[PDB]
Amino acid sequence: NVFNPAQFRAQFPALQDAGVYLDSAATALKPEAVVEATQQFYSLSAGNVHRSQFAEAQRLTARYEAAREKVAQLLNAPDDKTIVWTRGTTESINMVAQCYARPRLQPGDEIIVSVAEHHANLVPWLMVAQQTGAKVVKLPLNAQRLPDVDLLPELITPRSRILALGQMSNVTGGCPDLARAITFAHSAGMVVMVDGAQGAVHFPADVQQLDIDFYAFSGHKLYGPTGIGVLYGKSELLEAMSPWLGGGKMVHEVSFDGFTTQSAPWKLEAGTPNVAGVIGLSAALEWLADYDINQAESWSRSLATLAEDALAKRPGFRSFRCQDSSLLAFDFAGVHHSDMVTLLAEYGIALRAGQHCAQPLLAELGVTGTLRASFAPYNTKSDVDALVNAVDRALELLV
Amino acid sequence: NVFNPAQFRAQFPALQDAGVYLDSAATALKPEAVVEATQQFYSLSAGNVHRSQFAEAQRLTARYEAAREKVAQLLNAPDDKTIVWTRGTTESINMVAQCYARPRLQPGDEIIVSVAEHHANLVPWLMVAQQTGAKVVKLPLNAQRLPDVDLLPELITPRSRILALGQMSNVTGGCPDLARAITFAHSAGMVVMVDGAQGAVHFPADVQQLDIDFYAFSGHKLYGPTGIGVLYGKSELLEAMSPWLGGGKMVHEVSFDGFTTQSAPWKLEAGTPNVAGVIGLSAALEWLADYDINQAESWSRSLATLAEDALAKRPGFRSFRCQDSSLLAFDFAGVHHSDMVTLLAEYGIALRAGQHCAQPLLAELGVTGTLRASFAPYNTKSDVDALVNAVDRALELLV
Ligand SMILES: *Cc1c(COP(=O)(O)O)cnc(C)c1O
Ligand SMILES: *Cc1c(COP(=O)(O)O)cnc(C)c1O
């Protein structure tokens, strides 16, 4: 189970054309298993007849049927009925806000949201706050740029009901002390929405050991299809939630006088699922299971380190990176980000700049945007050199 | 632009393995263009670098960027910003209920829902009725099994605010007189949710000539990806709607004090889109545009006729088919549906039985379930013979 970066790399058909692909934290390239399972799914009938490809069809069904269990295995969830399909981390969090919090929250209740949250884990709370007369309370950063979990006892009041906290920022790659935050929140009877969109990729959460109430992530960042994500909830919480969308499949009986719902997870999954997305995510998970994530992520982090140490030698560098993360957000003094993104792309280096859906974090860091190079296990030491060499030449052209 | 069934048929890689595929109204097979565009999308970087497949990458971008316009062209919508991406007809209708109706509806307002509606166009109305103290009012069927649009003046009151009406039933294939219903509803100041999940496939609605307020459909029935659908709304209505999910992309500015939203359609599209679904749907639409839908649908309907006339010669047949539809729902006296589905599948015939997410319609028809064979332009006269021959033998084994 020894991680071999060249073995991992060989599985990604896009890699040759992609150049030096350093934007995995926006979205990941896919291994051949995800490409092939999706191609089979769309190249075969989903019906009950197979005159020549029965083997391939039985595989697809087996991938679909095992898919909740593959997510449960990634999170150490105790059973697969705690896994709910969504179209992404965004939908998952809105489902918790609307189906769990909205029916419960009273005027004046408080929702503590960290300053490092992606918009996905902030906007739905501002909305449900408006809807219920509840209030969003800021969790600030500490001096090392992580949500200040030590502040929580001071910020928790009798009115505190929900904590929304990201396991890992898509800007700094920082992870707050999540075990401690959850200990403090639970002493106060609160429930915690953990945004795992980056955390599931890099440090997938053991939701039992961490006692996580709700955990959300997206397939497309976890080497997998677009349009699919997960909500994990403790079984009692999924049971406590109101239904989400209404329609087929989430009901048992329906008449003009009312309806009876399925139990979770189906209660929360109206209409035709994104079958291609569930099958491709299952394929991504089954492919990923062959790799030790600790070794893969240590490799990715080591490349970010090489890059950050090198870039730190050039005039005007600033890094926003925390905890030797695989994600390297940075700036250069006297450089327009979009110019640098474009010049890097001419050198065959794919990365991005912008606000990263993290306006309050950036405001707090005193910037309007950052460049961000993120490293994955299909990157190499030569990708780091290519990045640094391209930056040198961009600086020469721009500064 | 002469329709040629053999030309249309040749485009579907699944067909050989699929046998005689008669379940298109549950979900459609895909043409090679949708398979290939999805394979390219997942086999290439979505980033800014392409060292060898720049041509393929520019195509994918062009498919994505033209995709709203391809939907607008199918519906004769006046502009592409009236097209909103969803994960399916179900989400589209819930978005209209939650974002348009819920903020407006007062205790006692009335929502008229036809007895022929799929659950997708009934459950979200029962939910928003509960939420707002509004009431769902039944639109009954006439003697020909269509929603009784002539009854509408009698059923419309001062309190009537919304009409939910299916353009085409997924059971009977029946289409109510939609122009007239919309005339009556609009005289009353009401808005109309038109469920087009089947109608977009067979008789795609001209939303201008029909003056449709909201129209919904799903990609997977329109020869296209799972996990993608459309909401069309008149521009003033999309503007009037509250935001749907909160998160990235649907906002401009976000802080702890509030947020400003994009205008429609983006206002209503939080988080990372289902990019593979948008690109594959665009590919399905561009492929479909080469065919005259009138000729294709007349061919599909002609096969359903051949099948229904033949099956009507066997003892115990009952048909639920309306208007010589491409969809043929039926029963045989003294036959357990699931037995017949299984025996047909041994003969290589793929169809299904069940409630078709239409409990109130079935209750009204006096049945618990129907078989349903649905015909598409990739079906043939020999498929009709195969179906009839298999039924004969099933009857012999079962009755
Ligand atoms: C399929 C269907 C729906 C629901 O579509 P989903 O893709 O499952 O959201 C709604 N109405 C009719 C008439 C349908 O056939
Ligand atoms: C990507 C991301 C999201 C949102 O994911 P979608 O797939 O766009 O719904 C939320 N949080 C973090 C930390 C992310 O990186």
Phi, psi (rounded to 5 degrees) for B261 = -100, 155
Cα B26 from Cα B221, distance rounded (Å): 7
User: Cβ(B14)–Cβ(B30) under 8 Å?
Assistant: yes
- This structure was determined by X-ray
Interface test with B, best of A21, A50, A117, A256 (most B CBs within 10 A): A256
Neighbour tally for B121: CB within 10 Å? 28
Determine the Cα–Cα distance for residues A127 and B258; give it in Å rounded to an integer: 9
Kindly state whether residue B128 falls inside one of the protein's structural domains. yes
Q: Cα–Cα distance between A115 and A137 in angstroms, integer?
A: 10
Question: At which of B272, B291, B310 does a domain end?
Answer: B291
CATH code at position A93 = 3.40.640.10
* Token pair in block for residue A5: 């970066």
Catalytic residues of B: 357
How far does the centroid of ligand 1 lie from the alpha carbon of residue B212, in Å?
A: 18
Q: Which of B43, B89, B247 has the CB atom closest to A271's CB atom?
A: B89
Closest CA to A93 of A135, A136, A124, A131: A124
Measure the CA–CA gap between B169 and B204, rounded to whole angstroms.
14
Q: Which residues contact B214 (CB under 8 A, 6 or more apart)?
A: B92, B96, B100, B191, B192, B193, B194, B231, B232, B233, B234, B237
Note the ligand closest to the C-alpha atom of A167: 2
**In a shared domain, residues A308 and A298:** yes
DSSP state letter for B91: H
φ/ψ of B337, rounded to 5, equals: -60, -45
Do A147 and A76 belong together in one domain? yes
- Which residues 6+ apart lie within 8 Å of B164 measured at CB? B93, B111, B112, B113, B114, B117, B121, B122, B125, B192, B193, B195
The phi, psi pair for A239, rounded to 5°, reads: -65, -40
Quote the DSSP letter at residue A328: E
Q: Which residues of B touch A276 (CB under 8 A)?
A: 38, 225-227, 276
Long-range pairs for A293-302: beta carbons < 8 A, 24 or more residues apart: A293/A202, A293/A203, A293/A204, A295/A2, A295/A3, A296/A3, A296/A8, A296/A377, A297/A202, A297/A203, A297/A326, A297/A377, A299/A3, A299/A5, A299/A377, A300/A202, A300/A326, A300/A375, A300/A376, A300/A377, A300/A379, A301/A325, A301/A326, A301/A375
Query: CB under 8 Å to B350, separation ≥6 — which residues?
Result: A45, A47, A48, A49, B18, B19, B20, B21, B22, B23, B344
Taking CB atoms and an 8 Å cutoff, what residues of chain A touch B383? none
A307 and A277 both lie in a single domain: no
The single residue of A99, A175, A322, A357 carrying the catalytic annotation is: A357
Q: Are residues B286 and B188 in the same domain?
A: yes
Q: In DSSP terms, which residues pair with A252 in a beta bridge?
A: none
Resolution of the experimental model in angstroms, please?
1.8
- Give the single-character DSSP code of B103: T
B positions 128-147 inside 8 Å of A (CB): 136, 138
Write down the residue that tokens 């919309």 correspond to: B182
Cα–Cα distance, B63 to B299 (Å, whole number): 29
The DSSP code sequence of A79-130 is: -GGGEEEESSHHHHHHHIIIIIITTT--TT-EEEEETT--GGGTHHHHHHHH
Sign of the CA dihedral B123, B247, B73, B57?
Answer: negative
Residue A338 contacts B where some CB pair is shorter than 8 Å: no
The kind and range of the H/E element at B192 are strand B191-195
Q: Closest Cα to residue B322, out of B116, B21, B105?
A: B116
Q: Name the region of B356 (left: φ>0; alpha: ψ -120 to 50; beta: rest).
A: left
Residue whose token pair is 């280096």? A349
d(CA B297, CA B201): 9
Any atom of ligand 1 within 6 Å of the Cβ of A246: no
**A138 shares a domain with A26:** no
Burial string for B308-317 (b: 16+ CB within 10 Å, else e) reads: bebbeeeeeb
Query: Do the Cβ atoms of B3 and B364 come closer than 8 Å?
Result: no
Question: Are B56 and B159 in a shared domain?
Answer: yes
Does residue A225 contact residue A34 with C-beta atoms inside 8 Å? yes
Shared domain check, B208 and B351: no
* CB proximity B349 to A under 8 Å: yes
Torsion of CA B76, B79, B81, B87, to 10 degrees: 10
- Whether B399 is covered by a domain: the verdict is no
- B374: tokens are 């649905």
Residue with tokens 């002539």: B150
Q: Which residues span the domain enclosing A381? A: 3-32+292-394
Read off the tokens for A95.
């489902």
In a domain, B158, yes or no: yes
Q: How far is the CA of A70 from the centre of ligand 2 (A)?
A: 21
- Does residue B193 share a domain with residue B55? yes
CB contact under 8 A, B259 and A123: yes
Do B156 and B272 lie in one domain? The reply is: yes
- Among B267, B291, B315, the domain boundary falls at B291
A357: annotated active-site residue: yes
Q: To which residue do tokens 């209503």 refer?
A: B268
CA A60 to centroid of ligand 1, rounded, Å: 23
Residue whose CA is closest, atom 2 of ligand 2? A197
- Contact indicator for B222, B199 with CB cutoff of 8 Å: no
DSSP class of residue B319 equals: E
Residues A299 and A278 in one domain: no
Give Cβ neighbours of residue B383 (< 8 Å, ≥ 6 apart). Answer: B20, B22, B303, B375
Cis preceding linkage at B265, omega within 30:
yes
Tokens describing residue A70: 């593959």
End-to-end CA gap in chain B: 47
Residue A7: partners with Cβ closer than 8 Å, 6 or more residues away: none
Residue A134's closest CA among A161, A112, A106?
A106
Interface of A with B in 147-206 (CB under 8 A): none
What is the edge-to-edge ordering of all strands in the sheet holding A317-319? A317-319, A327-332, A371-374
Tokens for A324? Answer: 């030797």
- Gaps in chain A (C to N over 2.5 angstroms) fall after none
- Cβ atoms of B323 and B198 within 8 Å: the answer is no
Residue A331 is part of a domain; what is its CATH number?
Answer: 3.90.1150.10
Decide whether any atom of ligand 1 lies within 6 Å of the B93 Cβ: no
- What are the helix (H) ranges across chain B? 5-9, 15-18, 32-43, 54-75, 89-95, 123-132, 152-155, 178-187, 199-202, 235-240, 275-288, 293-311, 337-346, 359-365, 381-398
Which of A245, A281, A342 should be substituted to probe chain B, the one whose Cβ sees the most B Cβ atoms within 10 Å?
A: A245
**Shared domain check, A114 and A44:** yes
Residue B188 Cα distances to A113, A332, B102, B159, B195, angstroms: 45, 62, 19, 9, 20
In a domain, A399, yes or no: no
B271 DSSP assignment: S
Contact between B213 and B178 under an 8 Å Cβ cutoff? The reply is no
Residues B389 and B313 in one domain: yes
Count of domains in chain A?
Answer: 2
* Helices (H), ranges, chain A: 5-9, 15-18, 32-43, 54-75, 89-95, 123-132, 152-155, 178-187, 199-202, 235-240, 275-288, 293-311, 337-346, 359-365, 381-398
d(CA B321, CA B370): 11
Q: How far is the CA of B198 from the centre of ligand 1 (A)?
A: 7
Q: Which of B291, B314, B329 is the last residue of a domain?
A: B291
Q: What angle do CA A198, A201, A203 make, to 5 degrees?
A: 90
